[PDB]
Design a protein around this ligand. Structure first.
Ligand SMILES: Cc1c[nH]c2ncnc(C(=O)N[C@@H](CC(=O)O)c3ccccc3)c12
Length: 167
């Protein structure tokens, strides 16, 4: 039993809700919140911009130190950093950005990072400003993640399409 509330069960381990991931993180304080990161950990907009804003820019400060030490992530890769006031940890995961020409096949590699964590609160990777079809992203999530994932979909209209169209 965990604290996540109001989710629709899609499979044994994948759950979905129409919700704002920032507000959901502040309410649940999960062990892991996933950020929709880029390789530079520049959290300017989309999910990343919103999560960073909610930390009063502390996520960005920590991220800049991480990059100065380690260099950029790989597309499809991840790193674990602090969750600040939102969660114990933030798993920064880089899905391919279609608006940069990046191979959509890397979306599966990106979701594989979730399997290193027993339970996570997450967005659909490569959705929103990353330009991928959220229906495809959901299919990859369900077919790749084996740990317990609680997916937050900000847009009410998109959520209904994902549910109503889920196979
Ligand atoms: C851009 C942005 C800023 N802050 C955010 N917080 C959470 N999500 C998103 C985002 O891009 N969402 C996508 C996917 C989803 O509905 O989850 C979406 C799809 C259709 C219509 C609107 C938005 C953002």
């Amino acid at each position: 039993v965990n604290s996540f509330s109001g989710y629709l069960k899609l499979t044994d381990n994948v759950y979905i809700k129409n919700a704002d991931i920032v507000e959901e993180a502040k309410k649940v304080k999960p062990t892991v919140v996933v950020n929709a990161a880029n390789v530079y950990l520049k959290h300017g907009g989309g999910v990343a911009g919103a999560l960073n804003k909610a930390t009063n820019n502390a996520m960005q400060v920590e991220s800049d130190d991480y990059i100065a030490t380690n260099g950029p992530l790989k597309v499809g890769g991840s790193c674990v950093l602090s969750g600040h006031n939102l969660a114990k940890h933030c798993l920064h995961v880089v899905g391919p950005n279609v608006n940069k020409g990046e191979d959509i096949q890397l979306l599966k590699s990106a979701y594989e990072n979730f399997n290193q964590h027993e339970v996570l609160l997450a967005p659909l990777l490569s959705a929103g400003i990353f330009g991928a079809d959220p229906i495809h992203s959901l299919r990859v999530c369900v077919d790749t993640v084996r740990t317990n994932v609680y997916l937050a979909v900000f847009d009410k209209n998109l959520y209904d399409k994902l549910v109503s169209s889920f196979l």
